[PDB]
Sequence to fold (726 residues):
Amino acid sequence: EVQLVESGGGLIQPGGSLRLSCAASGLTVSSNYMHWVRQAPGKGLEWVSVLYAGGSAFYADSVKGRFTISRNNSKNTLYLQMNSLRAEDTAIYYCARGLGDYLDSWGQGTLVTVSSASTKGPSVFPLAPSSTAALGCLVKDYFPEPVTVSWNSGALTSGVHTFPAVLQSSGLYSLSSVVTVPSSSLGTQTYICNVNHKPSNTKVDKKVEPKSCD
Amino acid sequence: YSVLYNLAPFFTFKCYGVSPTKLNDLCFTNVYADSFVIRGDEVRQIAPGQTGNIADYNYKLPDDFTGCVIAWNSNKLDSKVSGNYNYLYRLFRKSNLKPFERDISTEIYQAGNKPCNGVAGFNCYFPLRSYSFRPTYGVGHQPYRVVVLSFELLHAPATVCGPKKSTNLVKNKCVNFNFNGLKGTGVLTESNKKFLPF
Amino acid sequence: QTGNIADYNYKLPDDFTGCVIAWNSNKLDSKVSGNYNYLYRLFRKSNLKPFERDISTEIYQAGNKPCNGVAGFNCYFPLRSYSFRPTYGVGHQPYRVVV
Amino acid sequence: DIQMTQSPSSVSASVGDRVTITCRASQGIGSWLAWYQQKPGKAPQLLIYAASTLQSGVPPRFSGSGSGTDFTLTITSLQPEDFASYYCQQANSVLALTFGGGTKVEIKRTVAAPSVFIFPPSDEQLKSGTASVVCLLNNFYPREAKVQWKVDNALQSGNSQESVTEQDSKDSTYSLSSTLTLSKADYEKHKVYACEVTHQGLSSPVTKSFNRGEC
Ligand SMILES: *[C@@H]1O[C@H](CO)[C@@H](O)[C@H](O)[C@H]1NC(C)=O
Ligand SMILES: *[C@@H]1O[C@H](CO)[C@@H](O)[C@H](O)[C@H]1NC(C)=O
Fold:
């Protein structure tokens, strides 16, 4: 009966301006307390901002008050203003409400990604199975998150294991995807991996087949 | 105010608008005392401009406020192992109110679009919660008895004044006496005349 | 004048001749966590003479118990730190006063 | 400066087993306590509201209480759907700012033997000037997966990064892959590149060896 939805997220340059929207179904935003929590990849949740009854708001100690809270009771929604984006600001955003220093209902969430570096396409390198068998594809030097890897356009789903993204020393993400296939079908069935993500708008299809020697 | 030193764990003054040096000579025609209990980890919440969970909901301090506030440790008086439930605090309300007022009404809070009509259901909870205190808590969760002191300057005839009368008298000597404001020099000598009481 | 500083910190005689200069230092001398480098005195045995600096670190004694160089019962530290912050009002705004 | 860290980092338990997680606070906090279940792919869900009372839509078997600076949480009758990250948020009385690192729980796979495979770098990647060697480990349990590298029968340290997936919903398996990253000029300097795996399910360590250029 109660569901929270978020919209307006997406790719944005550092220092840009954007307004978030969060409408409460069956609840009045002018009465209850709302909370904002962030969770960057690789670490846990972190509280962002809270709104009081009116004319007062408290922010994080590390930040310098770069979010302003504006609420309109006519539309029963909430607005936030993005200012002074940094590289650390890239995190998932959850619309939350609170009461008595406790949190009960959270929204599905919206994504805000600050990209100091330009978006680059992913480099796909095949992993040829040497003479069951293990084969896969290697995704290297791609940014930002996320990427979805499918085999045979989603036809191959058994044994597929998509490894989580890791951060290299150069600031670029790396990802690997493998699938376990019996060796009797190595020469009869052709296996292709789909590497594509909308930030780069690059569609790469790679064929993995065994070969002699190296 | 000379009985101000009674407790070893006595907390500092942190007076707002009136220095503690000049409280004795200055006279206040009316003194208002407001006492209520505050937890130990928001002892700095009582200040003009500063907001929080209790500052704008239970007792708001105006910017043009004169007086002082004081606190002391009382963890061995209002604490028990089972738990104290006599003290209650308000948590949910529509908005902030004017300073210097008392609120008694404890109606059901309205949070959703559909009214609850006094029924404790969804989107409506009891705003009045208790002070859960235990004797095994840390240094930031002790019950502190706090009294708020305020004065009024230039509003009525003043009667409350500190003791400035030199605590001794003179006989058979000319001194610069100060008899309730007037300054004069002369020998205090017994008079045989009869003086009316007024 | 009579006050916290006009009695125990800095006095000006009646025959003083000169000028008093003031400027806002909130953009330079303030700190986000508070500037505790500047301190002021609140306790003294007697009134301070004009054009005299008090650098004594002795603990002020109110009762008969000797403080022994530390605070305690009827013993308080005369030195107190300022609350210079840029996000507060005029009272917490530091001012550069040159006499 | 809350300074909270959840210990231990990770535990392994199954249905009918005993498991618990302890979250402590550096400073004294009152009886207020809460716990959250954070699973990937969706928003986390709450567990309890007060110190002991539970939520309406949570299993009644979740147990956790405390009075001092130390708090703990445990499950009575474990279910496969309760394998997610655990977080603690007791109280702050001003803004509710308290949390820890977190702890992830996984279910056993009868101590399965790992499937070790070695992936030579592709010729396309060698043209770019970077050589990546990946040692694949699959269908294994527990976390004690050694990917100790051996290049020309010599020890290697500080050159590979390991990544572990989440547990599968069908067979409850692990998946680990470590990529050995080196420059092109250092790749042809050596000849033998191998990775050895030590596991409880293997009586002896299993080493997969491939040679650069040599068939
Ligand atoms: C005036 O007072 C004195 C005592 O103070 C008294 O002896 C005298 O009789 C009084 N005068 C008259 C007229 O009664
Ligand atoms: C100077 O020192 C003496 C003690 O040696 C003290 O009695 C006096 O009050 C001091 N002067 C001032 C202006 O405080």
The pocket of 2-acetamido-2-deoxy-beta-D-glucopyranose (ligand 1) is lined by residues B 193-194 (CB under 6 Å). The first strand of chain C starts at residue 21 and ends at 24. Residues 84 and 92 of chain C are 5 Å apart (CA to CA).
